[PDB]
Each structure stands twice: as C-alpha cells, then as structure tokens.
Design a binder for these strands. Structure first.
Lengths: 135, 532, 83
RNA sequence: GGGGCCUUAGCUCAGGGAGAGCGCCUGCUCACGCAGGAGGUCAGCGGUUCGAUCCCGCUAGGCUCCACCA
RNA sequence: AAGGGCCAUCGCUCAACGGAUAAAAGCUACCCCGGGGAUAACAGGCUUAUCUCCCCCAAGAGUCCACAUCGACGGGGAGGU
RNA sequence: CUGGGGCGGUCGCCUCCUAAAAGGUAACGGAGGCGCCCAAAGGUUCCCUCAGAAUGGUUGGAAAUCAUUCGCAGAGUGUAAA
C-alpha cells in the first residue's frame, strides 16, 4: 500500500484523463512489460495486488519495475450526509493513467512466464491492457 | 561512629598539618561533598567535607575523587570569599559534632579579611555554613533552612549566625552521682549525660561489666589521642570508631590514619538503588521464563503418541494385503516378535488408515518440534539472565551502565572505549576483568590474542577475566582462580572450580553464550580484597 | 482560595485530607474566629493553628496553585509559636 | 456523528528554557513524622521559531454537552 | 454674550464590520393569521454511494487436487425491495 | 446565510488557486493571513552584495567567531501569500 510520505495539499481536484500519456510509453528498464489501452485511476491496493500476484507466480523472478506511483489523493465524504459543508476527507491514494502508458515491467524471466504474470495482474486491474516488449 | 570524640581527635590531628594552610583550589564533586586542594606545611593535600546525611563527615583523602566539570553555586561562592585562603586555626565547637575553621584571605582590594567556616555534622540534618568573624552574619549556606520548621536557629545568608541548642549534657563517677544506675539500659542514657556519644560506643562501654572506670579511662584515652583507628565488621554491618571493638565477634582491621580509615570505609547508595531496581526486573524475567518452560514441560506430557502411530503405519504398509476395507482390528506382528492388535476405521481402507497414522505421527512430530524450539529459546534466555545476574553480582557501575544499554538493545528496557577493569596479580602482573557481559566479550576478543589464556568458572555462571597474554606462572594461575571465585554465581563458595583455557578455543558463538575448549580445570575457592 | 488548598500549596500540611480533618476538628482559627476547610483566605490574613498543644500564629502574603517546593514558603510568614 | 476541555513522574495533578502531593528506595525514626535520590515522549505526527509542555495545524484516546420537529 | 458655522482633531470590535434604536433574552404541545410545494416528514421520480444478487482472475483451504464445495488481496456488472 | 429548519460554522479586509492565457466571475470550494509595526525598519547622499558547501582548523561541539575558493541568488526583502 504505497504512500507519498509528504504532500503540499491533502485535497486536490480530481482532474481529467484526456489524451495519451506523456512518457513511460515503452519498456526500457525491463524486457517484457504491460501497457494500458484506456484511462483510469488506479489505487495502491490494486497495484500491490498485482505486484504480489506476479511475484507469487514468479517466486524468484528477476525484477519488476512498477512505473507509477499513486501521488494523487482522493476524498470521500462520510456516509449518509447531505451535500456541502466543505470538501470530504481524504480516503486513499491514486495514480492517474493515460493510455499508451506502461505500468509494470519484467526482466530476468522468459516471455511466457512474463505474459502469464502480467495476465494475472491485468485481471486484478480494471482496465484493458496489452503485452509489450522492448525494441 | 562520628562522635564528638572522633571529631575532637580530628580537630587537633589536622591542625597538626594545616596550620595556616593555603587554600589553593576549591571544588564540589558531588551534591553534599566539597574538596579543597590546600597547600600547608610546604605540601599539597586534599580536604573532603561532607554534609551527606548518613555519610556526613570530614576527611583528607589520597583519592582526589573527581573535580566536576560544572562549578556549582556553592563552590563558586566559596571561591569568592575563601580562595587562596589561610587556615589560621581549627576549633571543635565544644566537642559537639561540629567544627570551625578560622580563615584569613585578602579581599578584592588586597585588604586582609577573615571568616568562620562552620561544619555541623548532626546526622540527617547536617549542614555546612560560612559566617563573618565579627558580625557573625551568615554569608553562604549549603542547606538553607527556613524557620517553617519553627526551629531555634536559621541558615539563610545575611542573618546573624546561630548555633544549635547545646543540650544539658556534661560533654566529658558523675554518672553514678546524677544517674540512678538502677534505671538499666544505660547505654541509652549516657547520651543523656555526655555530648559526644554513639549508641555503639555506649553499648560497647556498658558491656564492660557500676562502671565509671570505663568512661574515665576511655575519655583519658581520647584526650591523649591514645585511640586505634580501625574498622569493625560484626557479620557485615561494618562499623568503625576511634577505639577498637570492645566485645563483639566482629572482625577488625586497623589503620595508621583515621583519614585512611574513612577512605577505605552521596552516590554509591543511589547506584545501589538503581542496581537493585534493575536486578528485581531481571530476576522477574528469568523466574518467568523458568516457570514458562515448566508450563511447557508439564503440558508436553500429554501428547506423545508419535511412535505408536509411526510403527502402526509401518506395520500396516507391511500388511496391506491381508486386510479388508471394512474391519475394526488387525492382529499384527512386530518385526522380539510380539503380536499387536491395531484398531481401524471400519469405513476406511487399510491404505487410508495407515496414511492417517502417518498423518498423526507427522502432526505430533511437528508439535513436539515446536515445543522443543520454545524450550530452547526459553532456556537460552534463562541462561543469559543467569550469567547476567552473576555479572550484576560481581559488577561495577562502569559495566552496569553498559549492561543497561545491552538490555535496552534487547528491548527489555528503554533509555565509548572504556572496557576493562583490573587490579594487582601474582608475578607483579595485571589481570583484567569485566562484570558486564559486553565488556567481558570486548576484552576477550579485542584485548587479547588467540594463544593467550582465559580464566573463568568451570561451572554454571561467573565472570570472565584474564591478563594480557595470560601466560604467567602457576602463582598467577591460582591467583586468577580467586578472582574467578569472587565474582561467581556463588560468591564465598569454598569449593568453586575455575577453568583456564587458551583463548584460541574461546567460542564466540544469546550474547555471552561462550563455550570453551583447550581447557583445564582446578578446584579453588573465593578470597578477599587481597585478590586485587 | 480555600484553607485546605492553601495549607497544601504552602506545604504547612502535607495532605489536603489532613487539612480537611484538622479543620473539621476545629483545632485552628483565622483572625480569632473558628474556621473550616472551605473558609476563604487572602493576603494580609492572620492565622492561628494547633498541632496538639503546639500553637502557631502566621501571616498570609500571597496565594497560587503551581507552588514549587521552595517558593511555597514565600506565600506566607511565621509570626509566633506557643504551647 | 458535531462542539468544547484534557492527555506531563507508578497514581492524582499544577506548570517559549520539568514542578507538587501521593506511593517506592534510604537514613533519621514499634508507628508516624522529617531529609535525600529514582521514576519525565510533556498522547502521536507535522509545522513555525535559534529554541517548543507552552505557539500553530492534523491525528488517537478520555470526558462533558448536543444529537431535535415531523 | 450664550450658541452656532468653517478649519484641524478626538471619542464605536456599531465584529451581524454600508452600521435599523443610546437602550433589549426565551417557551408555546393551549395557539392564531397570511403565504408556499419558491422549502422539510410519507409515497412517487433521477441517481444507486449504501443494500441485495450475479460474475471475472485465482492464490490458497480442500490429505494429494484451484474450480465437489469454499474463495483471500483485487476487479466488473444487474436490480431498484 | 443555510442543498428544509434548528444546533454547529461564518458575517468586514488582504494574498493565491479554482479563473477556462485581458479584466471580471460563484459555492457551507481549497490554503493562509489583518484589526499592526519602525522616530528608524522613513527621506537623501555615499558605500557593497547574500544563502549553503567543502576546506582550515586550540576552546568550539553536528552546530559559534574566524580564513580560502566554489559560488544569479538556494539568502534577504518588519509581517501571510503572490
């Protein structure tokens, strides 16, 4: 459950996930990676689920290199409450994702193993994905 | 001990040295303790004063203990008005447990001035005061005392000094005149007639059995300075006085100087409090671990059916061809050719049943392994704390300070080269030791070689000590055994064997779990401070 | 302030419980009047007290709660003792 | 759930450069009193300032008060 | 002359800070009038966070064996009680 | 005022974001400050240039005051921010 240690503002606007990514569109730390085909917010619980999933499938395998970090916080008012009276309290932390963006990489491991692990992770994630490799 | 008699003896016998002693330096090492490095009779000497209630006294010490890094208020006030002084005269305050120094010194303009330093040693309410000569006004005071105690006298500066109410006691037959000897328990009421009295002195004199003779003789003795400064030890409870011991069974050690007597006899007791408070906790933990393993052991005696199931599975796999599925029992022979009747599940196959026996064997095996590991843990801890208590028994504060941090590191507690301590040894040698486990290990590893010799207990628990490259004669070999038996699990045990072994076989395997080989062992016993 | 609190903060009496007890016994008085633990006090007050036969007379200078040990006695002055 | 107050020695609790009393240890003194030492995150986190019990914010606990009209 | 005017200046957390008076708190279930669906309680409606139900990946449990039956961390939907 | 009212909270002014590249722009939207201070902390003339680093080193230490090169600026600008 990743966390930014320190932040300026505990409360931010949400934003808009228009367009494609700026960077991180291609694997370069590792060999076999995964990228997105949509745009969405992703949570520390999602990423750690995917991470531990692939690492359990691999059991010693090489290196991973996540390519993101949930910097963004997201609020949520308490339950059964009218509107207004200030912005809701923070709940967790979020990473924002554009399409064309690489999320997880892999090295030290064969292609079939990598593809299967990333499949497993994709099923923990909400969005549509693609298997990718380095050029 | 510190009677008016001892006082008066000191009054003359220190004026013997310090006529006009030039006060070269002043310090206040501890709270109720003050040092003067004085220059008298063409020599430098130390002068300790103490208003520390139980240990309040005066002394001259070869051991200039430690001048502080902080000059306290009282010390600096003494520096203000006494520094570079001149000890004109000493006085006894009329044999009460009180002393006076008549002192001279030049003021800030070189004009000569005088003062009267008073040292009242009353017991729990001793004090040190400084006063003007002519005005008798107090200038300084160690224990300021407000008249809220509704007392006769007062301490505070500026005020005219006053002495305590001197009681109606003839300070030096007269007791047979005034006091009715029928009263009994007169060791009490000699205090009611004389000024300088201890109940110790009174009892030891009353036990001389009408005895005015003893009083007069001992008073003449003291007046003549005919005493013998010794320390008495009645089964511990080490006492001392001008006169020797009179009757009791206690051991006696004599001295040439009352000052050296005081030396060899404010913070020691504090360290003792800390040590005991820690020792309680350590013993609680060790006792707890011992009872913990007792629980585990007496629990272990009720699930031990492993081997039966093992042997049953063996036999069933051996006889997996005579056996129906649906049967209750099996008359079976062991591979000694007994004939065992193993029960079955009449629903299961013999394969299933035998596999279940193997499963139960596996499970009991697992649980026993768990309990044995917990046993190993607890016993390691108990031995660690037992060695620790041995060290704490044979400890010094310098190693206790390290032991505390060791335990805080072990997280039993919460909140840099000085390692070893040594004394004399045979062959004019030096034997180093450490009551702390950590310091002992530091010495054993980093302060000697492999071919050197380590000497410790040949028994359960004791300290670790050795000389630098301990290869001296059998004299030193037997002398190390005394130091070993002194700081051991059983001090003063006259049957303690010591193990001497080459450091090359010293096993550096909890902490201080040091095994040993290349060892010999010699029966020995504890000893005295001559072991130093 | 109250007499029992005052006695404690001035450290005349070591326990507020004891101050209450002795004031309920009425061993003490203020300005020649018998008093109680709830009796009010102020600067310039003249207090009479007993400890068995030991009779004591004292004068009030100040009052406070935080009362560190040596500063406690600045709060008042002893005048006199009798028996 | 909201608002306010508080969280400091073992307990009770005072208070922009750590205190008391109670209880422990000690001597004095059977049983109290009287003199010393110990025990301190100033609840936690973060911030301001040279510097934080103290000033600021957030969080955890406790307590008190409110939590309503259909 | 009193007094007034002009000029300079003082006096208000009038802080509910364009300040109603120099001067002011509450209960009404014993209540009343004028109006409102411009605004609340029921029901209806939109939403479906929540609720219920279904499903995906599948580690793991299941002696062995993921999918007999259960199903973690996570994910996606339906319904409109 | 009020996403019914009540209770809570707020009521004036300043700075930023929201604010959509002039300006302006709401919400019980997000962050913070003011109800002053200086008789020199003003005016003028003349002067010069900071923060840190390393590195030197009696005290003095992580950390004084000292000396050296590096050093658009990491400092300062009475106070909040721009």
């Amino acid at each position: 459950m990743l966390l930014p240690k320190r932040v300026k503002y505990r409360r931010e606007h949400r934003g808009k996930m228009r367009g494609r990514a700026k960077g991180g569109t291609e694997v370069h730390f590792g060999e076999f990676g995964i990228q997105a085909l949509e745009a969405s917010w992703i949570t520390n619980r999602q990423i750690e689920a995917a991470r531990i999933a692939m690492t359990r499938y691999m059991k010693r395998g090489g290196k991973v290199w996540i390519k993101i970090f949930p910097s963004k916080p997201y609020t949520a008012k308490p339950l059964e409450v009218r509107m207004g009276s200030g912005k809701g309290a923070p709940e967790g932390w979020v990473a924002v994702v554009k399409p064309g963006k690489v999320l997880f990489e892999i090295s030290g491991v064969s292609e079939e193993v990598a593809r299967e692990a990333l499949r497993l992770a994709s099923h923990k994630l909400p969005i549509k994905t693609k298997f990718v490799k380095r050029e | 001990s510190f009677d008016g008699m001892f006082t008066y003896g000191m009054t003359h016998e220190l004026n013997e040295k310090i006529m006009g002693g030039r006060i070269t330096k002043i310090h206040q090492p501890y709270k109720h303790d003050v040092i003067f490095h004085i220059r008298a009779k063409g020599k430098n000497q130390k002068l300790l004063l103490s208003a520390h209630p139980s240990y309040s006294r005066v002394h001259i010490t070869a051991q200039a203990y430690e001048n502080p890094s902080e000059p306290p208020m009282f010390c600096m006030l003494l520096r203000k008005h006494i520094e570079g002084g001149f000890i004109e005269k000493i006085e006894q305050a009329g044999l009460a447990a009180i002393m006076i120094f008549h002192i001279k010194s030049r003021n800030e303009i070189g004009d000569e001035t005088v003062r009267k330093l008073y040292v009242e040693i009353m017991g729990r309410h001793s004090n040190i005061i400084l006063t003007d000569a002519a005005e008798n006004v107090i200038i300084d005071g160690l224990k300021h005392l407000s008249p809220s105690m509704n007392s006769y006298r007062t301490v505070l500066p500026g005020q005219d000094y006053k002495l305590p109410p001197a009681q109606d006691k003839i300070s030096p037959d007269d007791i047979l005149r005034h006091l009715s000897f029928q009263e009994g328990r007169l060791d009490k009421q000699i205090v009611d007639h004389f000024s300088g009295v201890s109940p110790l002195f009174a009892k030891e004199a009353v036990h001389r059995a009408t005895l005015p003779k003893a009083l007069l003789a001992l008073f003449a003795e003291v007046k003549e300075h005919r005493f013998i400064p010794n320390i008495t030890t009645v089964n511990g409870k080490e006492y001392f006085y001008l006169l020797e011991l009179t009757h009791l069974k206690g051991e006696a050690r004599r001295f040439d100087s009352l000052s050296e007597l005081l030396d060899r006899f404010a913070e020691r007791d504090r360290v003792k409090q800390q040590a005991q408070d820690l020792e309680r906790f350590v013993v609680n933990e060790r006792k707890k671990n011992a009872n913990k393993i007792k629980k585990l052991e007496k629990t272990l005696e009720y699930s031990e059916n492993a081997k039966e199931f093992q042997l049953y599975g063996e036999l069933l796999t051996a006889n997996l061809y005579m056996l129906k599925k649906g049967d209750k029992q099996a008359e079976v022979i062991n591979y000694e050719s007994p004939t065992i009747t193993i029960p079955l599940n009449p629903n299961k196959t013999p394969s299933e049943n035998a596999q279940a026996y193997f499963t139960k064997y596996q499970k009991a095996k697992n649980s026993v392994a768990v309990v044995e590991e917990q046993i190993r843990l607890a016993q390691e801890e108990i031995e660690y704390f037992d060695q620790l208590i041995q060290q704490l028994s044979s400890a010094s504060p310098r190693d206790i300070s390290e032991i505390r941090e060791e335990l805080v590191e072990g997280k039993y507690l919460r909140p840099h080269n000085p390692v070893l301590e040594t004394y004399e040894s045979t062959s004019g040698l030096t034997i180093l030791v450490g009551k702390n486990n950590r310091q002992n290990e530091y010495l054993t590893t980093r302060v000697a070689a492999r071919d050197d010799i380590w000497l410790h207990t040949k028994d359960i628990p004791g300290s670790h000590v050795v000389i630098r490259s301990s290869e001296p004669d059998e004299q030193t070999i037997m002398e190390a055994a005394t130091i070993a038996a002194y700081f051991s699990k059983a001090k003063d045990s006259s049957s303690v064997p010591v193990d001497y072994t080459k450091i090359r076989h010293v096993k550096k395997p909890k902490p201080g779990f040091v095994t040993y080989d290349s060892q010999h062992t010699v029966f020995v016993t504890p000893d005295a401070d001559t072991v130093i | 302030m109250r007499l029992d609190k005052f006695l404690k903060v001035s450290r005349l009496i070591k326990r507020r419980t004891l101050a209450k007890e002795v004031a309920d016994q009425g061993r003490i008085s203020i300005n020649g009047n018998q008093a109680k633990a709830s009796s009010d006090v102020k600067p310039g007050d003249e207090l009479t007290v007993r400890f068995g036969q030991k009779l004591v007379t004292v004068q009030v200078n100040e009052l406070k709660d935080t009362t560190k040990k040596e500063e406690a006695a600045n709060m008042y002055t002893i005048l006199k003792e009798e028996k």
